[PDB]
Amino acid sequence: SRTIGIIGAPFSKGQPRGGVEEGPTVLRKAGLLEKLKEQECDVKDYGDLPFADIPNDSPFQIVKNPRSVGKASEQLAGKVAEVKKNGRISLVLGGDHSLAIGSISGHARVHPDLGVIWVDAHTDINTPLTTTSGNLHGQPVSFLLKELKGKIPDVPGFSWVTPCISAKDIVYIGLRDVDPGEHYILKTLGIKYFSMTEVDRLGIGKVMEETLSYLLGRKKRPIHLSFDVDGLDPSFTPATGTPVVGGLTYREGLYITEEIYKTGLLSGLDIMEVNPSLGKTPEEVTRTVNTAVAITLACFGLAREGNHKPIDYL
Amino acid sequence: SRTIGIIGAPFSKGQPRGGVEEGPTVLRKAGLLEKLKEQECDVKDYGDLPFADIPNDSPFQIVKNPRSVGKASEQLAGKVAEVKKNGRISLVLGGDHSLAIGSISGHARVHPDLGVIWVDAHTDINTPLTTTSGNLHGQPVSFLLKELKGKIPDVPGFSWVTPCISAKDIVYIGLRDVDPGEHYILKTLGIKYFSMTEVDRLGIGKVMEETLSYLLGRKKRPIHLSFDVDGLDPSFTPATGTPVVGGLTYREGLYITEEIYKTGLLSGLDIMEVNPSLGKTPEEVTRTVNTAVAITLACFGLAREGNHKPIDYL
Amino acid sequence: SRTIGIIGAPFSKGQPRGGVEEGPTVLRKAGLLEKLKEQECDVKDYGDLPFADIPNDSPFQIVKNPRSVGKASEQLAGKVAEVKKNGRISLVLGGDHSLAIGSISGHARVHPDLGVIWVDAHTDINTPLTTTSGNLHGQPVSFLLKELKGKIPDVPGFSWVTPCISAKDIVYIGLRDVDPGEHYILKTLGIKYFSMTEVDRLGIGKVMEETLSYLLGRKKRPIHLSFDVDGLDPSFTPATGTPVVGGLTYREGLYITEEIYKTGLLSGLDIMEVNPSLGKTPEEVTRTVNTAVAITLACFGLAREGNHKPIDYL
Ligand SMILES: N[C@@H](CCCC[B-](O)(O)O)C(=O)O
Numbered sequence: 001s002r003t004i005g006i007i008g009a010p011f012s013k014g015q016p017r018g019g020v021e022e023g024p025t026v027l028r029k030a031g032l033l034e035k036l037k038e039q040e041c042d043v044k045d046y047g048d049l050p051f052a053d054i055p056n057d058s059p060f061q062i063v064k065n066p067r068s069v070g071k072a073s074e075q076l077a078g079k080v081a082e083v084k085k086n087g088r089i090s091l092v093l094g095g096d097h098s099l100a101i102g103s104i105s106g107h108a109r110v111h112p113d114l115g116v117i118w119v120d121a122h123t124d125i126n127t128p129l130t131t132t133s134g135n136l137h138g139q140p141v142s143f144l145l146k147e148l149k150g151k152i153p154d155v156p157g158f159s160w161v162t163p164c165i166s167a168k169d170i171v172y173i174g175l176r177d178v179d180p181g182e183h184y185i186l187k188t189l190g191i192k193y194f195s196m197t198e199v200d201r202l203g204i205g206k207v208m209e210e211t212l213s214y215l216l217g218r219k220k221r222p223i224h225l226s227f228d229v230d231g232l233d234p235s236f237t238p239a240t241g242t243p244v245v246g247g248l249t250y251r252e253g254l255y256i257t258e259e260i261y262k263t264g265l266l267s268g269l270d271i272m273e274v275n276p277s278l279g280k281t282p283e284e285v286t287r288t289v290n291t292a293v294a295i296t297l298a299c300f301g302l303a304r305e306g307n308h309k310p311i312d313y314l
Numbered sequence: 315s316r317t318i319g320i321i322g323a324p325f326s327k328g329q330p331r332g333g334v335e336e337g338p339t340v341l342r343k344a345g346l347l348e349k350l351k352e353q354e355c356d357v358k359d360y361g362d363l364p365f366a367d368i369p370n371d372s373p374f375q376i377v378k379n380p381r382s383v384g385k386a387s388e389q390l391a392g393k394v395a396e397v398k399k400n401g402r403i404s405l406v407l408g409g410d411h412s413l414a415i416g417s418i419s420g421h422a423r424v425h426p427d428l429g430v431i432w433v434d435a436h437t438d439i440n441t442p443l444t445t446t447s448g449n450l451h452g453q454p455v456s457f458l459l460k461e462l463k464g465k466i467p468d469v470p471g472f473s474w475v476t477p478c479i480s481a482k483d484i485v486y487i488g489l490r491d492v493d494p495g496e497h498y499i500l501k502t503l504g505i506k507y508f509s510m511t512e513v514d515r516l517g518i519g520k521v522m523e524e525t526l527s528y529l530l531g532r533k534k535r536p537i538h539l540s541f542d543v544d545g546l547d548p549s550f551t552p553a554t555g556t557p558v559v560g561g562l563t564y565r566e567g568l569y570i571t572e573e574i575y576k577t578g579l580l581s582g583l584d585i586m587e588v589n590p591s592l593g594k595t596p597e598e599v600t601r602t603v604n605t606a607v608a609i610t611l612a613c614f615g616l617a618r619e620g621n622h623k624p625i626d627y628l
Numbered sequence: 629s630r631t632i633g634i635i636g637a638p639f640s641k642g643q644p645r646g647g648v649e650e651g652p653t654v655l656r657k658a659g660l661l662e663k664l665k666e667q668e669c670d671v672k673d674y675g676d677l678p679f680a681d682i683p684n685d686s687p688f689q690i691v692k693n694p695r696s697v698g699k700a701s702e703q704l705a706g707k708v709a710e711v712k713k714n715g716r717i718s719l720v721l722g723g724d725h726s727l728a729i730g731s732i733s734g735h736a737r738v739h740p741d742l743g744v745i746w747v748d749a750h751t752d753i754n755t756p757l758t759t760t761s762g763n764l765h766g767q768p769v770s771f772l773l774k775e776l777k778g779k780i781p782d783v784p785g786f787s788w789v790t791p792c793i794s795a796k797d798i799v800y801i802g803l804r805d806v807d808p809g810e811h812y813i814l815k816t817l818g819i820k821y822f823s824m825t826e827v828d829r830l831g832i833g834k835v836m837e838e839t840l841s842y843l844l845g846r847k848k849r850p851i852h853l854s855f856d857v858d859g860l861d862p863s864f865t866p867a868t869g870t871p872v873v874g875g876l877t878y879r880e881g882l883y884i885t886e887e888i889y890k891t892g893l894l895s896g897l898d899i900m901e902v903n904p905s906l907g908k909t910p911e912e913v914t915r916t917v918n919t920a921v922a923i924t925l926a927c928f929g930l931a932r933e934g935n936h937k938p939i940d941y942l
């Protein structure tokens with residue numbers, strides 16, 4: 001086995017909409033823990049993190065809810081490190097993507113040599129000074145990059161943060177909605193990425209080959225997969241805050257995750273931005289939840305060609 | 315010409331739902347025979363097979379309606395051999411997929427060296443002892459494989475059966491819902507298959523190249539194409555009994571069939587699992603029927619780049 | 629810069645439906661000129677062409693509204709040449725595709741060495757004698773080809789026409805509804821084309837590589853992109869007169885245009901067949917208009933990986 005350590009992170013202060021807080025709930029109600037155990041997985045639920053209320057949390061310049069988001073990630077980082085110290089793959093059922101700051105930070109405490117694969121329609125690499133929205137769920141990567149140390153002002157709630165990954169330790173997959181400042185950072189730091197243009201050009205097969213070769217070429221290491229459900233096309237994951245057309249297909253999403261699993265190096269996983277209250281219909285909500293579940297199950301073994309135990313079936 | 319021998323097989327006792335019996339009807343009402351003749355095809359309709367009612371047909375262990383399904387295939391095998399002896403490509407408009415037992419058996423009587431391409435979300439290779447559902451439409455392949463001789467118990471209605479194909483004579487395309495026992499059989503017999511994972515990785519172009527090279531590499535031979543409409547994605551063929559998301563696209567389905575046609579070796583064809591009463595709307599029914607028709611027309615020449623007679627059009 | 633010269637062509641007499649005349653309007657109302665200026669583009673609107681009414685325009689044999697379509701293109705050709713003489717890329721917001729006769733003709737007056745990329749589900753290469761519908765929007769290519777000189781009868785309204793392109797100067801992308809006579813012409817003149825079969829086989833990446841290499845292999849030259857919105861799948865562009873299933877995806881359409889832009893050789897562009905009154909719902913209309921806009925923006929720079937000015941963002 002690989003073992004799994006489930007972490008519910010019902011948090012939404014990284015952006016405007018509060019429904020993202022139900023992510024852990026509807027995902028759990030979909031039978032995630034059960035379907036995982038139905039597989040060759042040993043699951044341990046660490047519960048839903050209790051994020052205290054920070055009443056006094058006025059914006060920092062344009063940055064909104066800094067202390068709340070800062071504390072939420074600091075809290076999450078501690079939990080993730082713990083489960084990692086327990087020899088399990090951390091699975092964060094999230095609210096908004098700002099939690100990746102804590103998820104990747106906690107993970108790196110135990111595996112500083114980790115590599116990150118970021119599935120998303122966005123790069124979430126805006127800094128507290130380049131952001132136009134001020135929503136922290138669009139800035140997690142800037143806080144984690146060591147090269148961006150010096151460009152990140154002292155934002156309340158984030159003094160505990162220590163950039164743990166370098167520009168060369170991350171690969172983007174699915175980009176199609178990147179701001180100008182974010183694009184400048186991409187090219188300036190020489191960050192490796194496969195926007196939808198590259199997926200269209202090479203095919204998901206070549207994309208994954210290159211992504212894994214890029215991160216595991218020099219040597220094998222722990223992999224942290226940060227999956228934003230809007231990385232996929234909205235026809236598959238509509239109940240999300242920032243949908244963008246022309247996304248990855250259900251198939252490509254399952255292909256990305258099946259290949260990650262096969263490396264046997266998955267160490268940390270984030271399933272983020274699932275907002276049940278944003279589904280235009282109860283059918284769109286189930287579609288989003290069911291797709292999110294399928295993606296997660298694939299990260300832990302579930303193969304489309306089929307699976308079977310080391311037993312003589314005939 | 316190639317000539318075509320149409321065989322209506324309004325049968326449903328291979329599974330629970332009875333609406334699959336209307337397959338031949340709605341397909342014919344869609345204008346199949348007419349659209350085929352509109353092409354460079356010489357069509358001969360052998361009518362709809364009259365499957366007698368077997369009132370006394372209690373389950374065999376967990377296997378349901380064994381005698382009914384057994385007689386239906388025995389009946390179909392005879393018809394298929396006849397049309398094959400008449401020098402025509404047999405086209406079975408089916409009910410459920412259990413009829414493939416009779417379709418491939420009858421075909422092999424006249425062309426024992428045939429090769430099979432099985433388009434489906436499922437492998438339908440469960441044996442009477444490995445099945446959990448007991449529905450025979452999920453077991454046709456086990457009855458036909460010579461390697462599985464000895465694992466198939468004596469089921470009522472199937473004493474006439476003689477496995478005609480070896481593990482090496484078949485290729486699967488589109489798999490994404492395979493049971494554990496079925497997966498064990500796949501790997502144990504070294505069966506050639508392209509699950510959706512392989513389609514995603516290689517592209518339908520490479521998949522077909524390899525499939526045809528695999529079956530016609532050593533030498534040219536008759537090809538039997540067994541097409542289960544659920545092999546395609548449900549957004550294209552919703553009116554079907556066992557839909558699974560992440561299927562082949564309308565394009566890939568047309569690509570598979572266009573390439574098969576171009577081999578000039580198509581010998582037998584099955585269009586199965588079309589259930590009009592399962593369409594959530596009359597629009598989903600037409601969508602399923604129209605897609606099923608398009609796939610069939612492509613099997614006999616209809617090319618997307620266009621077609622034209624050996625005449626000077628200018 | 630590249631500069632852009634916008635030309636509204638509210639014309640519909642190339643086919644039955646009149647709603648195509650609103651193309652320029654709804655496209656403009658979508659914010660096209662604004663979104664373009666928001667980019668690195670210098671836009672100049674040349675207004676909407678005033679196509680006089682031709683009351684006396686009885687069919688020529690089977691050809692309908694010949695004088696009206698003939699005058700509309702003659703009018704458009706003059707405008708296009710002008711904007712080209714002004715050093716700008718001509719962008720024709722069209723009605724029906726018959727306007728391509730004038731668009732490509734006017735363009736060639738200033739750049740006789742141009743190469744054409746025709747995105748469409750159809751070849752629109754029927755001649756006035758091979759057409760079965762008589763709608764001129766399905767015949768534009770025959771009027772422009774020099775090889776077809778002698779096969780084009782003297783149709784009223786077209787005496788000003790002079791074929792400007794040879795069979796070797798054009799590439800088709802997206803074909804899936806080609807008539808027999810049209811297919812004969814394709815093969816007879818050895819026209820280069822990528823029907824949906826080739827897109828499926830090679831992938832859009834290889835298709836574009838080959839298309840551009842084919843047209844710019846011997847030397848660099850101006851490119852005229854004639855984009856029929858039905859080239860894309862109807863799930864993306866439903867509000868169109870002749871929809872055909874199995875079309876290019878939103879992604880492939882954006883890939884085609886992003887690659888064209890990157891050549892830095894785009895010289896002329898047509899956005900045709902957008903008919904707002906054909907949307908089954910107001911949502912299908914926005915879907916068509918929004919997709920049409922996205923395709924156009926990509927033709928002028930908008931990249932999915934992101935864009936940014938030559939400024940230090942940090
Ligand atoms: N770049 C926009 C969108 C960010 C979207 C964030 B995400 O990926 O977490 O949903 C912003 O900075 O606000």
Ligand SMILES: N[C@@H](CCCC[B-](O)(O)O)C(=O)O
Pocket residue numbers: 410411412434435436438440445446447448449451452453493542544555556587
């Ligand atoms: N493996 C399941 C599903 C079989 C589905 C059958 B089919 O492909 O014919 O629709 C069963 O054995 O019952």
Ligand SMILES: N[C@@H](CCCC[B-](O)(O)O)C(=O)O
Pocket residue numbers: 724725726748749750752754759760761762763765766767807856858869870901
């Ligand atoms: N080939 C048919 C259809 C032409 C469709 C024209 B189009 O591409 O401009 O919409 C006809 O000649 O009428």
Ligand SMILES: [Mn+2]
Pocket residue numbers: 120121122228230231242
């Ligand atoms: Mn996102």
Ligand SMILES: [Mn+2]
Pocket residue numbers: 097120122124137228273
């Ligand atoms: Mn994100």
Ligand SMILES: [Mn+2]
Pocket residue numbers: 434435436542544545556
């Ligand atoms: Mn099936």
Ligand SMILES: [Mn+2]
Pocket residue numbers: 411434436438451542587
């Ligand atoms: Mn089947």
Ligand SMILES: [Mn+2]
Pocket residue numbers: 748749750856858859870
């Ligand atoms: Mn067209």
Ligand SMILES: [Mn+2]
Pocket residue numbers: 725748750752765856901
């Ligand atoms: Mn056209």
